[PDB]
Amino acid sequence: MRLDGKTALITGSARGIGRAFAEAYVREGARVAIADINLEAARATAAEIGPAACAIALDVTDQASIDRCVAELLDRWGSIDILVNNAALFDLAPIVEITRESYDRLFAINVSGTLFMMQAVARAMIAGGRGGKIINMASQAGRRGEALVGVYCATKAAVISLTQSAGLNLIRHGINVNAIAPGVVDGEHWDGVDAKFADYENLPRGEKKRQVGAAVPFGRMGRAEDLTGMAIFLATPEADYIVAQTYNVDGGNWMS
Amino acid sequence: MRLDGKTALITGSARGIGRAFAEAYVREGARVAIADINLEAARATAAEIGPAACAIALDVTDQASIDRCVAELLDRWGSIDILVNNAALFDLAPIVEITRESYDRLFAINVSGTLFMMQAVARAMIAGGRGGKIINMASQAGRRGEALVGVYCATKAAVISLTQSAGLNLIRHGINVNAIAPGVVDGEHWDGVDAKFADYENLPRGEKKRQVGAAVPFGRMGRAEDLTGMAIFLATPEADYIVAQTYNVDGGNWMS
Incomplete structure (x- = not known):
């Protein structure tokens, strides 16, 4: 019970790493909010996790959706102790092929x-008068x-x-505001991503994902379970003196 | 003449640092384009600098304006050898006071x-078949x-x-694509900026600009003349092996 009696809002937690953190957080005795743009998947995951998790629709690109989300959780919980900005999008393309739609969307x-x-969330915490923890997801x-x-x-920069x-x-x-920088994490998205590189670099289908995972010093591609420990640690009082840092949890992929 | 017979497009060069680069490049025997959103000012500076400099309207936030500027210069010169992305906006405010409007512009x-x-410009250079030099302005x-x-x-990150x-x-x-990262360069704009900090941190009017200047290792605030040397160098062949770097020219304000 490292997070006993605490509330955490995790964006884009209907699936993937976001879901992992939620499950881990709940396991530590915390109440979590499965926020996602698609309320269907959110409710599904929230119900799958238990009475400790609740769903809520959220479009981080829309101020209205943002203010609604925060105000609603404030009434359901009375305070948001932890916020994990996990929602994100990925895309790739050479400089001469970048589109305004790719740019517009990823930055948004x-x-x-x-x-x-x-x-x-920060505005709420300040009002609350008892601080809080914010964890961003870099890479x-x-x-x-x-x-x-x-x-x-x-x-990400x-x-x-x-x-x-x-x-x-x-x-x-x-x-406290800090960030976690994963390395290469496995997931289904690697099917298409691999196809992309294979086509962009004249490589056999599947070679890219193989090269990448073998280049990791640790010897394998990442896993959600490799990240949950740090996600929990940064939210505890044993980290009260850790400020404005980005910690790499990538099996040695990059050294900071 | 270190840049003899070359052409350079410098954005936001009607005034400030952008203008210092243009005057310096012209001194090294180059033809330059004073691109600015305000053609009035652009023409004025071009006339002031001489027969080597020409003016042209440019709004870096509009694709149409971007394509027109490149196409026009390609007809006038035949090729763009150097591109200096100097155009930029500055703004400040605490987290809880950041406006969507402020965010939108600066990123735009x-x-x-x-x-x-x-x-x-890269597209044009690749089609040109003889490469080129691109210099971004970081900070x-x-x-x-x-x-x-x-x-x-x-x-800037x-x-x-x-x-x-x-x-x-x-x-x-x-x-070759590289960037220059200036420190604190003196300007009139510092009049308002100082006021901002003075108001935000309970400081006497003018104390902020003083403190910042005194903190620079070198012993004084930056000047446009401090940057021209690096601007020229990065566009010469003695820098052909310099790739993807950001060089700090800040009198020691930051070390990289």
Whole structure:
């Protein structure tokens, strides 16, 4: 019970890593909110997790949806103790092929979504008068640029920047802001991603995903379970002195 | 004449640092384009600099304006050898006071403008078949976040990221992409900026501009003349092996 009697809002937690954190958080005695743009999947996951989880519709790109979300949880819980900006989108393409739609969309969700979601919750925490914890999800992509991932990389670099700015600015109110930077995490999305690289680099279908996983010092592609420990640690008082940091949990993929 | 017989498009060069680069490039024997959103000012500076400089209206936030600018210059010069993305906006405010309006502009001009402007000129350079030089303008603000400069810092962090992604992707076509990161450059704009900080941190009017200047290791605030040397160098062949780098020219304000 490392998170006993605490409330956590996790964005884009209907599936993937977001769901993992939710399950882990609940296991530690915390009440979580499965926020997602599709209320169907949200309710499904929330019901699958138990009485400790509840669903709620959220479009991080829409201010109205953001203010509704926060106000509703405030009445159901009385206070939001932890916020995990997990909602994000991925895409890839060389410089000369980047489209305005790719740019517009990734920045709207990855950057804009994280920022205003932070602002909404931070304003509540300040009012609450008892601080809180905010964890952003960066990525190794945000540490260094890549030839075919310009747009995605740039959004993650921005997240790291915002974590530092928010961190220094909000710590005075007792709010810790830090981020976690995963490396290469397995998931179904790798089917198409691999196809993309295979086509962009003249590589056999499936070679890319193989190369990537073998290049990880640890010796394998990431897993959600590799991240939950840190997700929990940063939310405990044993981390009260950790401010505006981005911790890499990537099996050695990148060293910071 | 280190840039003899070359052409350079410099965005937002009607005034400030952008104008200093243009005057310097013209001194090294190059033909330049004073691109600005205000053609009145653009023409004025072009006439002031001489027969080597021409004016042209450009709004880096509008694809149409971007394509027209490149096409026109291609007819006038035949090729664009150098592109300096200098156009940018500055703004500051605590997290809880950041407006969508502030976010929208800065990202539109500082990030979006740099990316698509890069793509347009890169396309031309690749078609040209003889490569080229691209120089982005970063900032110390892109190296680490600040409490009251969240938006601006995030945009510059994204620039550094885009400079790396483009650098790695375009070097294969003979195009060098790098960035310059100035520290605190003196300006009139500092009049209002100082007022802002003075009001935000309970400081005497003018104390902020003083403190910042005194904190620079070198012993004084930046000047446009401090940056021209690096601007020229990165466009010469002595920098052909320099790829995807961001060089700080800040008198020691930040170390990389």
